[PDB]
Amino acid sequence: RHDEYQYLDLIRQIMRTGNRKGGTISMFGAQMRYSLRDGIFPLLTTKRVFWRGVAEELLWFVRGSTNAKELQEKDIHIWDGNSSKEFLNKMGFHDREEGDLGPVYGFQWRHFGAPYADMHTDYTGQGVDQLQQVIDTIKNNPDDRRIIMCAWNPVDVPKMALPPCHCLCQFYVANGELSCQLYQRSADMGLGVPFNIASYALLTYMIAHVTDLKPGDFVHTLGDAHVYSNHCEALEEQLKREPRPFPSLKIKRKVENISDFKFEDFELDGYKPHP
Amino acid sequence: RHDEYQYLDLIRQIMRTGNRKTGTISMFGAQMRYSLRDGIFPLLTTKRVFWRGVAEELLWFVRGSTNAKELQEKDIHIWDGNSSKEFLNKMGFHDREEGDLGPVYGFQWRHFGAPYADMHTDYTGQGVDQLQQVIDTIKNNPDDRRIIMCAWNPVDVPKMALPPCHCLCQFYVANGELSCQLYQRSADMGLGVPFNIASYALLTYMIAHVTDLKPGDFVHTLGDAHVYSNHCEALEEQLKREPRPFPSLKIKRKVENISDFKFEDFELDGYKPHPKIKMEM
Ligand SMILES: O=c1ccn([C@H]2C[C@H](O)[C@@H](COP(=O)(O)O)O2)c(=O)[nH]1
Ligand SMILES: O=c1ccn([C@H]2C[C@H](O)[C@@H](COP(=O)(O)O)O2)c(=O)[nH]1
């Protein structure tokens, strides 16, 4: 059975048995598994996913950036509404300049625990570089059961433009394969979840490449999994669609370090989503 | 189907198809759901679980303690091997006194982000009191999707006697019920997982009681779920056992705040487990 049916089945289950809150319909606790083997890339097909946005945002997290203007320069506007000087003033951050998202993902992955000042501050050597730590552990002690990267930082969540949906991820190595599990506290099934699967499947492909392992599975765990009430009609139309075979992903060259990837290094072949 | 079959089915699946890597046999990524409704308490029945240890350890976390001697005074020795002055010296903590586990669960739940000194330091008002925060959010904004308590603190994990297995938990409210999901990075299916289910089911019962809600579900999510190779014979004996109906749990009085619970406040009725099975190191 096509892996995308897990996603469609959960949407069907939520709309048919979920809890209505004043508007969403939700369920609590779900888990999906997507194979990443033999070049398979789980970019959902029953609706087009924003591949360019997935990859550019992930490269921006890997650089440790908290500056939304670096995404805007690449025509990525996912963090726009939360980076305006007007929105930042409404939250309570008065000396915060346009584009400064605060200590969001990039900062937590590269500098967890460092005191945040602004998006231009040199944080070199400050805090825990969890992304490099996971790479070092996968290479040196792959059976380790603490290969974790955490973005949910209770100290910093109030300083962020938005609290992170992707709380932590854990890696696992077996059979020459790298697997990843993501704990996502809040999942908009309609518009958020396909993008989120692609982000963490892509991070797994990147870390596998630089650790000389093959991608295994991406395990997606959800907390509050929900459908917005105004998307139900559109989702009933999407549930009529049969998933198309997933595209393949190849990395075009031997990339040495996780910081060395560029958008052009990815070759996404055969992506044929429904209209 | 009895909820305990989810646990038994995973043990069977791990031994049959798990990855062989002391040797472990493991799978990555699993999820179980245990109903906590109508007074049902998921204290596993295929082996007798240490109920007084589950409860006393949880009350010790709620107090914010990191002192294993407070558990020892109650004849609870679960944190002993990791609190000896010899073990603490091997880890690299030289000025650490006997019983000082470092900034483990109790400290992270009550004082996340505070600088840890020792187990006797007064941390009043320091760091984030995530447990009280969870309670305030459930009472004031129950639809909130950020009702989280995190014990995985990358800054403090190197100072802990042991890195936490229980990384975070999230709460959810619907139809007057409180549910909890635990993300457990590492799960020993033999002796670890039954105790761990009981701890977070009990925490859900306690928070539901103080927030005027009814317990809903406990969702248990696992990362590296495994069995030790030397426990396979014992686990094959456990798999022959049929689960008995779960016991019930009642809270004997109206407890106002999460910090006010005492072990005598719990009434666990009808616990009828099969005997313990030796699973040693
Ligand atoms: O990567 C992301 C970011 C956001 N959301 C959705 C989940 C919720 O619908 C909303 C975030 O709102 P809160 O859970 O923080 O209230 O956006 C996702 O699905 N994925
Ligand atoms: O509450 C706990 C604590 C420990 N363990 C088990 C999991 C592993 O077998 C071991 C911890 O070792 P690491 O995962 O930290 O290596 O103890 C549990 O199952 N539950």
Automatic annotation (TrEMBL), chain A:
One biological process term in Gene Ontology: dTTP biosynthetic process
Pathway in which the depicted protein is active: Pyrimidine metabolism; dTTP biosynthesis
GO molecular function: thymidylate synthase activity
Record's keyword annotation contains Transferase: yes
EC number: 2.1.1.45
Keywords: Methyltransferase, Nucleotide biosynthesis, Transferase
GO cellular component: cytosol; mitochondrion
Catalytic reaction annotation: dUMP + (6R)-5,10-methylene-5,6,7,8-tetrahydrofolate = 7,8-dihydrofolate + dTMP
Annotated catalytic residues: C165
Domain Thymidylate synthase/dCMP hydroxymethylase: 6-275
Keyword hit for NAD: no
Family per similarity comment: Belongs to the thymidylate synthase family.
PANTHER family on file: THYMIDYLATE SYNTHASE (PTHR11548:SF2), THYMIDYLATE SYNTHASE 1 (PTHR11548)
Name the record gives this protein: Thymidylate synthase
Organism for this UniProt entry: Penaeus vannamei (Whiteleg shrimp)
From TrEMBL, chain B:
First and last residue of the signal peptide: none
Catalytic function, reaction form: dUMP + (6R)-5,10-methylene-5,6,7,8-tetrahydrofolate = 7,8-dihydrofolate + dTMP
Enzyme class: transferase
Every Thymidylate synthase/dCMP hydroxymethylase domain range: 6-281
PROSITE patterns documented for this protein: THYMIDYLATE_SYNTHASE
UniProt record similarity statement: Belongs to the thymidylate synthase family.
The protein, known as: Thymidylate synthase
Organism: Penaeus vannamei
